[PDB]
């Protein structure tokens, strides 16, 4: 006269979750057994068997992928079955190897299987910390690493760790090259002059030096960019302006001299 009333249902859960299967019967104090892979389940640190009047539960704690599969409750000669599906954290979109000119920004992105995966980024196997240099971003299932102001030292293999999965890609930081170098300028007192250089990449950072000292942007000394050309325009030149000028971008430099003929 014992009847199964409510049968166990499939469970889908993340690895490391605690889950349960439940069978209910028509009578109090009916003994039950549970099976997985054709072996009877015993109480353990992983498995808890709880009977409460008509309700019988199998609880599985801290599940691993090996716990996946079909579980059977046996009540007399009556049986019922349900399955556990264990979702694991994994990569769903990989990262791209990239080449980035020095001084420019590099970025890596991947996509993962689940929300709320913690950020974990490595550079050559060593954990990276968020800083002004490294921007670490999560946007739902999208994970991004932004590397500012790249230099040779940033060329490396970068890895995102996602549970027991990981994905890697390489950054190669490429050298700025000067395709048209500075030329000397031979000027007269009160002239306005313009030094010009052309480089191979747009969007690079640079500075200008006067006898090795960084020049301040002023009305007199204007520094501008047009496409791949960078200029230093000096108004109303005098003897004090006669000097060696250097354009610097990344590891690339070009130097020329301004001559100013007086009076």
Swiss-Prot record:
Domain of life assignment: Eukaryota
Location of the protein in the cell: Cytoplasm; Nucleus
Domain Ig-like: 87-172, 175-257
Tissue specificity remark: Isoforms 3, 7 and 8 are expressed in cardiac muscle. Isoform 4 is expressed in vertebrate skeletal muscle. Isoform 6 is expressed in skeletal muscle (at protein level).
PTM comment: Autophosphorylated.
Family (UniProt): Belongs to the protein kinase superfamily. CAMK Ser/Thr protein kinase family.
Disease: Myopathy, myofibrillar, 9, with early respiratory failure: An autosomal dominant myopathy characterized by adulthood onset of weakness in proximal, distal, axial and respiratory muscles. Pelvic girdle weakness, foot drop and neck weakness are the main symptoms at onset, but ultimately the weakness usually involves the proximal compartment of both upper and lower limbs. Additional features include variable degrees of Achilles tendon contractures, spinal rigidity and muscle hypertrophy. Respiratory involvement often leads to requirement for non-invasive ventilation support.
The protein's assembly and partners: Interacts with MYOM1, MYOM2, tropomyosin and myosin. Interacts with actin, primarily via the PEVK domains and with MYPN. Interacts with FHL2, NEB, CRYAB, LMNA/lamin-A and LMNB/lamin-B. Interacts with TCAP/telethonin and/or ANK1 isoform Mu17/ank1.5, via the first two N-terminal immunoglobulin domains. Interacts with TRIM63 and TRIM55, through several domains including immunoglobulin domains 141 and 142. Interacts with ANKRD1, ANKRD2 and ANKRD23, via the region between immunoglobulin domains 77 and 78 and interacts with CAPN3, via immunoglobulin domain 79.
Domain notes: ZIS1 and ZIS5 regions contain multiple SPXR consensus sites for ERK- and CDK-like protein kinases as well as multiple SP motifs. ZIS1 could adopt a closed conformation which would block the TCAP-binding site.
Further remark: In some isoforms, after the PEVK repeat region there is a long PEVK duplicated region. On account of this region, it has been very difficult to sequence the whole protein. The length of this region (ranging from 183 to 2174 residues), may be a key elastic element of titin.
Function in brief: Key component in the assembly and functioning of vertebrate striated muscles. By providing connections at the level of individual microfilaments, it contributes to the fine balance of forces between the two halves of the sarcomere. The size and extensibility of the cross-links are the main determinants of sarcomere extensibility properties of muscle. In non-muscle cells, seems to play a role in chromosome condensation and chromosome segregation during mitosis. Might link the lamina network to chromatin or nuclear actin, or both during interphase.
Protein name: Titin
The species this protein was found in: Homo sapiens (Human)
Residue numbers of the full-length protein present here: 2795 to 3053 of 34350
């Amino acid at each position: 006269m014992v009847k199964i009333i409510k049968k166990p249902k499939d469970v889908t859960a993340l690895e490391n979750a605690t889950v349960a299967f439940e069978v209910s019967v028509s009578h109090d104090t009916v003994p039950v057994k549970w099976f997985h892979k054709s072996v009877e389940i015993k109480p353990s640190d992983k498995h808890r068997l709880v009977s409460e009047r008509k309700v019988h539960k199998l609880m599985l704690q801290n599940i691993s992928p090996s716990d996946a599969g079909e579980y059977t409750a046996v009540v007399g000669q009556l049986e019922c079955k349900a399955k556990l599906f264990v979702e694991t954290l994994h990569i769903t979109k990989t990262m791209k190897n990239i080449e980035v000119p020095e001084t420019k920004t590099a970025s890596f992105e991947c996509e993962v299987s689940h929300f709320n995966v913690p950020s974990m980024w490595l550079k050559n196997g060593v954990e990276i910390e968020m800083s002004e240099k490294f921007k670490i971003v999560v946007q739902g299932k999208l994970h991004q690493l932004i590397i500012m102001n790249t230099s040779t030292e940033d060329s490396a293999e970068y890895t995102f760790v996602c549970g027991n999965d990981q994905v890697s890609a390489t950054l190669t930081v490429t050298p700025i090259m000067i395709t048209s170098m500075l030329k000397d300028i031979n000027a007269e007192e009160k002239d306005t002059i313009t030094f010009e250089v052309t480089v191979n990449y747009e969007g690079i950072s640079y500075k200008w030096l006067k006898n090795g000292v960084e020049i301040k942007s002023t009305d007199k000394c204007q520094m501008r960019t047009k496409k791949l050309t960078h200029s230093l325009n000096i108004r109303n030149v005098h003897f004090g302006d006669a000097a060696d000028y250097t354009f610097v971008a990344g590891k690339a430099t070009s130097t020329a001299t301004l001559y100013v003929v007086e009076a």
